[PDB]
Design a protein around this motif. Structure first.
Motif, PDB file in Angstrom:
ATOM      1  N   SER A   8      43.226  -5.057  46.380  1.00 24.45           N
ATOM      2  CA  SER A   8      42.270  -5.849  45.634  1.00 24.45           C
ATOM      3  C   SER A   8      41.087  -4.948  45.308  1.00 24.45           C
ATOM      4  N   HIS A   9      40.340  -5.317  44.271  1.00 26.12           N
ATOM      5  CA  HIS A   9      39.131  -4.563  43.957  1.00 26.12           C
ATOM      6  C   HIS A   9      38.089  -5.480  43.325  1.00 26.12           C
ATOM      7  N   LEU A  10      36.843  -5.038  43.422  1.00 30.14           N
ATOM      8  CA  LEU A  10      35.712  -5.581  42.696  1.00 30.14           C
ATOM      9  C   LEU A  10      35.160  -4.455  41.834  1.00 30.14           C
ATOM     10  N   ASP A  62      33.681  -7.434  37.122  1.00 29.53           N
ATOM     11  CA  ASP A  62      33.756  -7.389  35.660  1.00 29.53           C
ATOM     12  C   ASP A  62      35.140  -7.079  35.158  1.00 29.53           C
ATOM     13  N   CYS A  63      36.124  -7.218  36.025  1.00 26.46           N
ATOM     14  CA  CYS A  63      37.519  -7.011  35.700  1.00 26.46           C
ATOM     15  C   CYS A  63      38.226  -8.364  35.694  1.00 26.46           C
ATOM     16  N   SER A  64      39.204  -8.509  34.790  1.00 26.86           N
ATOM     17  CA  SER A  64      39.986  -9.742  34.704  1.00 26.86           C
ATOM     18  C   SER A  64      40.714 -10.059  36.002  1.00 26.86           C
ATOM     19  N   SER A  65      40.922  -9.058  36.860  1.00 25.87           N
ATOM     20  CA  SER A  65      41.518  -9.302  38.162  1.00 25.87           C
ATOM     21  C   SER A  65      40.749 -10.329  38.978  1.00 25.87           C
ATOM     22  N   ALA A  66      39.524 -10.670  38.577  1.00 24.97           N
ATOM     23  CA  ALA A  66      38.678 -11.543  39.381  1.00 24.97           C
ATOM     24  C   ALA A  66      39.252 -12.955  39.482  1.00 24.97           C
ATOM     25  N   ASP A  71      42.734  -9.269  43.489  1.00 31.34           N
ATOM     26  CA  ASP A  71      44.040  -8.653  43.685  1.00 31.34           C
ATOM     27  C   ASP A  71      44.573  -8.059  42.387  1.00 31.34           C
ATOM     28  N   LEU A  72      45.177  -6.872  42.492  1.00 28.68           N
ATOM     29  CA  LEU A  72      45.891  -6.252  41.381  1.00 28.68           C
ATOM     30  C   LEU A  72      47.397  -6.279  41.546  1.00 28.68           C
ATOM     31  N   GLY A  73      47.891  -6.574  42.736  1.00 27.62           N
ATOM     32  CA  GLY A  73      49.295  -6.417  43.007  1.00 27.62           C
ATOM     33  C   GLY A  73      49.603  -5.030  43.532  1.00 27.62           C
ATOM     34  N   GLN A  79      49.992   5.364  37.236  1.00 25.77           N
ATOM     35  CA  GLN A  79      49.717   4.150  36.480  1.00 25.77           C
ATOM     36  C   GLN A  79      48.238   3.951  36.172  1.00 25.77           C
ATOM     37  N   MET A  80      47.383   3.981  37.195  1.00 22.35           N
ATOM     38  CA  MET A  80      45.958   3.714  37.076  1.00 22.35           C
ATOM     39  C   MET A  80      45.182   5.016  36.904  1.00 22.35           C
ATOM     40  N   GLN A  81      43.891   4.873  36.591  1.00 23.26           N
ATOM     41  CA  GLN A  81      43.011   6.033  36.513  1.00 23.26           C
ATOM     42  C   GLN A  81      43.018   6.780  37.842  1.00 23.26           C
ATOM     43  N   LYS A  82      43.179   8.105  37.760  1.00 27.87           N
ATOM     44  CA  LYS A  82      43.328   8.936  38.953  1.00 27.87           C
ATOM     45  C   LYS A  82      42.319   8.630  40.056  1.00 27.87           C
ATOM     46  N   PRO A  83      41.005   8.502  39.789  1.00 29.18           N
ATOM     47  CA  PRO A  83      40.079   8.243  40.909  1.00 29.18           C
ATOM     48  C   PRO A  83      40.406   6.969  41.661  1.00 29.18           C
ATOM     49  N   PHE A  84      40.723   5.898  40.927  1.00 32.13           N
ATOM     50  CA  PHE A  84      41.158   4.653  41.554  1.00 32.13           C
ATOM     51  C   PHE A  84      42.461   4.848  42.324  1.00 32.13           C
ATOM     52  N   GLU A  85      43.423   5.546  41.712  1.00 28.53           N
ATOM     53  CA  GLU A  85      44.711   5.782  42.356  1.00 28.53           C
ATOM     54  C   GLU A  85      44.557   6.592  43.643  1.00 28.53           C
ATOM     55  N   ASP A 103      36.280   5.532  34.547  1.00 25.84           N
ATOM     56  CA  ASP A 103      35.731   5.262  33.220  1.00 25.84           C
ATOM     57  C   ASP A 103      35.421   3.776  33.037  1.00 25.84           C
ATOM     58  N   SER A 104      36.155   2.903  33.735  1.00 21.73           N
ATOM     59  CA  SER A 104      35.884   1.475  33.666  1.00 21.73           C
ATOM     60  C   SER A 104      34.545   1.096  34.294  1.00 21.73           C
ATOM     61  N   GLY A 105      34.044   1.886  35.250  1.00 25.35           N
ATOM     62  CA  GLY A 105      32.867   1.513  36.017  1.00 25.35           C
ATOM     63  C   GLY A 105      32.968   1.853  37.497  1.00 25.35           C
ATOM     64  N   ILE A 106      32.242   1.116  38.336  1.00 27.28           N
ATOM     65  CA  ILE A 106      32.195   1.380  39.770  1.00 27.28           C
ATOM     66  C   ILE A 106      32.999   0.327  40.526  1.00 27.28           C
ATOM     67  N   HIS A 107      33.780   0.791  41.499  1.00 30.11           N
ATOM     68  CA  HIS A 107      34.759  -0.041  42.175  1.00 30.11           C
ATOM     69  C   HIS A 107      34.474  -0.045  43.662  1.00 30.11           C
ATOM     70  N   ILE A 108      34.710  -1.205  44.294  1.00 22.89           N
ATOM     71  CA  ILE A 108      35.033  -1.298  45.711  1.00 22.89           C
ATOM     72  C   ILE A 108      36.514  -1.656  45.773  1.00 22.89           C
TER      73      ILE A 108
HETATM   74  C1  LIG Z   1      40.846  -5.344  35.951  1.00 28.56           C
HETATM   75  N1  LIG Z   1      41.494  -6.472  36.112  1.00 28.56           N
HETATM   76  C2  LIG Z   1      42.818  -6.354  36.018  1.00 28.56           C
HETATM   77  C3  LIG Z   1      43.453  -5.156  35.781  1.00 28.56           C
HETATM   78  N2  LIG Z   1      44.909  -5.141  35.718  1.00 28.56           N
HETATM   79  O1  LIG Z   1      45.453  -5.930  34.956  1.00 28.56           O
HETATM   80  O2  LIG Z   1      45.518  -4.387  36.466  1.00 28.56           O
HETATM   81  C4  LIG Z   1      42.629  -3.994  35.612  1.00 28.56           C
HETATM   82  N3  LIG Z   1      43.059  -2.703  35.367  1.00 28.56           N
HETATM   83  C5  LIG Z   1      44.343  -2.248  34.796  1.00 28.56           C
HETATM   84  C6  LIG Z   1      44.526  -2.281  33.261  1.00 28.56           C
HETATM   85  C7  LIG Z   1      44.679  -0.870  32.691  1.00 28.56           C
HETATM   86  C8  LIG Z   1      43.368  -2.981  32.551  1.00 28.56           C
HETATM   87  C9  LIG Z   1      45.817  -3.054  33.002  1.00 28.56           C
HETATM   88  C10 LIG Z   1      42.124  -1.630  35.737  1.00 28.56           C
HETATM   89  C11 LIG Z   1      41.821  -0.599  34.635  1.00 28.56           C
HETATM   90  C12 LIG Z   1      40.762   0.260  35.315  1.00 28.56           C
HETATM   91  S1  LIG Z   1      41.429   0.567  36.924  1.00 28.56           S
HETATM   92  O3  LIG Z   1      42.098   1.841  36.966  1.00 28.56           O
HETATM   93  O4  LIG Z   1      40.433   0.306  37.929  1.00 28.56           O
HETATM   94  C13 LIG Z   1      42.627  -0.760  36.898  1.00 28.56           C
HETATM   95  N4  LIG Z   1      41.299  -4.134  35.713  1.00 28.56           N
END
Ligand SMILES: *c1ncc([N+](=O)[O-])c(N(CC(C)(C)C)[C@@H]2CCS(=O)(=O)C2)n1
Length: 113
Positions: A8-10, A62-66, A71-73, A79-85, A103-108
């Protein structure tokens, strides 16, 4: 290391994020300095017990995951941006990262699986 982790992330966006808008705010007006203050203040409340990580992600990420409480699954690498990955895979399950900049912003981040 497993083939995939579940996290999960914020996210707190700022005015210089890749897309400076979110579901909860049509134009992100806050500075990256203010985004990190929020991130750091969320971390302290989560550490004190004053706030619950997923309650905060469902209100202020500020992510639709909210809508899924942060949770992202499950995801593999590549798949994801390297720093997050990288940050996600360096966590033990149940461990919460510090700040994470993409690039999306700041994450926990909180690894769950
Ligand atoms: C926020 N909410 C959902 C979500 N997602 O659907 O996994 C993301 N997401 C992945 C997408 C590329 C938008 C599908 C994030 C993009 C920035 S990240 O690497 O933190 C994951 N974001």
């Amino acid at each position: 290391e497993p083939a995939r982790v579940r996290c999960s992330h914020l996210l707190v966006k700022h005015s210089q994020s890749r897309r400076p808008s979110s579901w909860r705010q049509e134009q992100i007006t806050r500075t990256q300095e203010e985004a990190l203050e929020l991130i750091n203040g969320y971390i302290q409340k989560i550490k004190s017990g004053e706030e619950d990580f997923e309650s905060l992600a469902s209100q202020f990420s500020d992510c639709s995951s909210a809508k899924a409480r942060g949770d992202l699954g499950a995801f593999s690498r590549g798949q994801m941006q390297k720093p997050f990955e990288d940050a996600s895979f360096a966590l033990r399950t149940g461990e919460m990262s510090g700040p994470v900049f993409t690039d999306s912003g700041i994450h926990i981040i909180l690894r769950t699986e």
